[model samples]
Target: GLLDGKRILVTGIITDSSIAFHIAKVAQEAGAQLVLTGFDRLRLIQRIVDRLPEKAPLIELDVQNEEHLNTLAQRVTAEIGEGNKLDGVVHSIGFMPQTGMGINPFFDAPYEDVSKGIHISAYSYASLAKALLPIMNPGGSIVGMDFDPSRAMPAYNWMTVAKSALESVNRFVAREAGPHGVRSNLVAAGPIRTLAMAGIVGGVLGDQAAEQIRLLEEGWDQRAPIGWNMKDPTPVAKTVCALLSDWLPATTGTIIYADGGASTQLL
Candidate 1:
């Protein structure tokens, strides 16, 4: 019960197999009541609601939907009550149209598609954090799921730019939110079988990267005594739980690597 007596908001859950789904389940098991958000896939989310342990409540929210953004705070307050006021939030939302990926840089990508990536993947975190800041309790955690943005993945062109923007957003959010006693950080986990990863071109490029991942995991402790994991998201989840639970009171604007030593060596 690490997160016991906490209230959390988990976004981007579309299916039971989704990454957000696992975060939601673990949050509930850790003792937090979750408020789920569904954007364009209402039918799909409605079906997934049955799978939640407590039949978690759903809120219709497209982060890009300005009208909803304006009233989100009050609406959420009404549903979950102002007292709960969000103990933490996990942003699992990131998207880029297929057309924006593959052999294209920002200049080559369509403006609307490029805008979509920034708005959803990067800007939404700030938007949500701002809306909740007034009612947010001290020591609240804001964690975002991100990939390694230091380099470009095959066909991840514009989306890579989006993630770079996301990293910057995390820093600024942490700085401003820090004064309010809220912490912000990014959890850059190794690729999992989540739907978002599967949709990427490099992900569909077969299992070639799998071997490289194996080698990295095997050699993780060469630099530091602490090890890492590739297939298990529980480790990453634990890192997030620690951030939310007052375990790291002074840590903010930080990027926790759950890449299993992938970030350690030169490859």
Candidate 2:
């Protein structure tokens, strides 16, 4: 309940179990008003919005589309209304094409195909913030998720590069936007289950790797230092809400891990 009276924009909700959905659900519980975005699946989004505490409003977004980027602020103003400015934005969107991720060998993949993932997953962080910055309230937070691209993960080749770029972009956003009192930060979570995760695993592994994810979870469960397991969207959501709250007024361009001390784990 940290975000009482806060207006938050949450992107990347596609299913009931989506990380974005969990974040939105938690934000509403914490007393925030939410506006969610969908890129391609409004019908499914319609089914999912009602599951929230209140029916959340939907906005169509495609990070790759220039028109969408240009009109985002105006549309948001229309949706939330002129005087009702945003307090925070939750960006949970991450994607890498099958060509960039799995199946294709690293050198064999062209930059054009590889860069699609970077465009959406990495560059969109700044672009989206830029679009909404004019309309955002001072002291507002722009929170994005990172998947710890420090290590070269299997099935996540180029995406590791894309995610790493996201971390760098956040710092720059924080630096450029900090003077405006708009903070940018990230929440890096342990492996979690969802349609998005499942979709990612499939393309990246060639076998549509569901079993690979199970293997990942098993390792995560045993290695997490505190809870000793990975269960998310909730574990990660509370962390995002805290960053959104006024309590962390002085922090920006930082990453807080909700991985139950797994960052320190070595096996």
Candidate 3:
């Protein structure tokens, strides 16, 4: 009941296997009222929502659509309540056009594709924050998803760059929103199986599958002192909820690693 009585807006859930989906379920279990966002896949998203522990209302949100962004504030405010503030906002939005992924080399990917990737993966965080901050209750938190983009990883391409921008974006949000008592942070989770990942050219399977499996058998599992589970997002979801709770009152602008300590290696 850490988030008891809290109202949270969660976005980016496409299926049951999605990290955002698990986050919504956990948020509800912790006593937070949830509202989800769906776009072109509204029916599919609704079907997935039906499987959650509790039912939640879905709103339409296409981050790339200017009208959607412009009207998001009013619509969400109306759905939650008039002048009733939101306690937390979970930003799990991310995407990369096929051309921006492994199929295209870093230099070959068109600017349009690169821009699309960043707009959805990185820029949307700021967009969502701006649209929702007015209704964010003081002392509320905003949590985002991240993969360490400090360095390029194989097959990650432009989305890696997007994540780097996302990290910087989190810092900026924290610095500016802190005065308003809105804490901003990200959970840099390790690789996990999700619908979005499946879109990548060399995602968790094919040629990259060998590499990922090798990492699990000889790299991640061996390096992460506590071991790692690529299939389970519980730890990451739990970390996000903790940030949303009052327990991390003094924490802001931080990337809390929930990758089973896989980031600790020096080799």
Candidate 4:
């Protein structure tokens, strides 16, 4: 088992379809002792946790809350026991205000919306890693989710900027934390039909949802040699587990594309 005896923190699990949920399942099966963090929906998240192969302790963690960031080590330590160190942390958190969703022109959105978007999507990665450093095992890995920030997608404006910032944050964290024997990386997954995307795509039963799926199927489906499944997140989840394992020890400050080979296409 790649993660045997490892203790890991997984955040941003909201439902069974979530990429984080799949990661948690795969991580547990790989022998990791896991803990999860939820924000305003603790009860909802708790219900989902019950459906996992093994239950994980859930802690309240609104990433923007300074106190929560500061107390993460203590709370997690209490949950997992004093001496058990975290071997890895999976950062699957992200968000953007409705305004920042590119509904209006990018420049038309207020500064507050942009600020909130970047803070949650980008800043939290560094903040969470810093908070966990005190209790993270040496040579541990930290992985965050990302969409390709190299290009722009329609209706994904400020969130695109947020993702760009996130990529930069991953590199900086890798450089700063490398000496501490910690590695930071991002997994640029292709589109999947998760709750977050559902919100961004705007309602499940409408032309918006239909168009969103159409674009992915036509754009990504044709480009990706292995094809793409917006409903299945297993490939991305397994890739995350690989990053958490000792197999990629020397790899850090990198983006691993789990987009079914779409990222490699030239046309």
Highest lDDT among the candidates is held by which one?
4
Task: Show where candidate 1 strays beyond 4 Å.
Answer: 103-107, 199-232
Candidate 4 on 1-267: residue-level lDDT in tens? 888988999999888898999999999999999999987899999999998889789999999999999999999999999798898999999988877765566678799999998999999999998999778888799999999979876646788899999999999999877877889999999988787676556553345544654575568877999998888999999999999999999999999999999978967
Name the lDDT of candidate 1.
0.76
Give the Å error, residue 192, model 1: 1.4
Residues 1-267, candidate 2: write the lDDT tens digits: 699989999999888777888899989999999988898888888788878998778989999999999999999989888788999988899887766665667776688877888999999999999998888899899999988888876646787899899999999999977877899999988887676566655554556455555666677777776863334568788888999999999889988888877777888
Q: What is the TM-score of each candidate against the true structure?
A: 0.85, 0.93, 0.93, 0.95
Candidate 3 per-residue lDDT, tens place, 188-259, comes to: 988786755644423533466345434543566677889888778888899899999999988888899988
The clash count of every prediction, one per candidate, is 0, 1, 0, 0
lDDT of 1 by residue, 1-267 (tens): 888988888888886766677788777878888888888889889789778878778888899988887887787788787566888888888888755665333366788888888999999989988877776789888888888788865435677788899999999999889878899998887656555544442344235433433343445445433555434566667666667776787888888887665676663
Which portions of model 4 show Cα errors greater than 4 Å?
Answer: 199-213
Candidate number with greatest TM-score: 4
Q: 1 or 3, which is superior by lDDT? A: 3
Q: Measured by C-alpha RMSD in angstroms, how accurate is candidate 1?
A: 3.7
Candidate 4 whole-model C-alpha lDDT, 0 to 1 = 0.88
Q: So what's the TM-score on candidate 4?
A: 0.95
Q: In model 3, what are the clashing residue pairs, if there are any?
A: none
* Reference-based lDDT, residue 134, model 2: 84
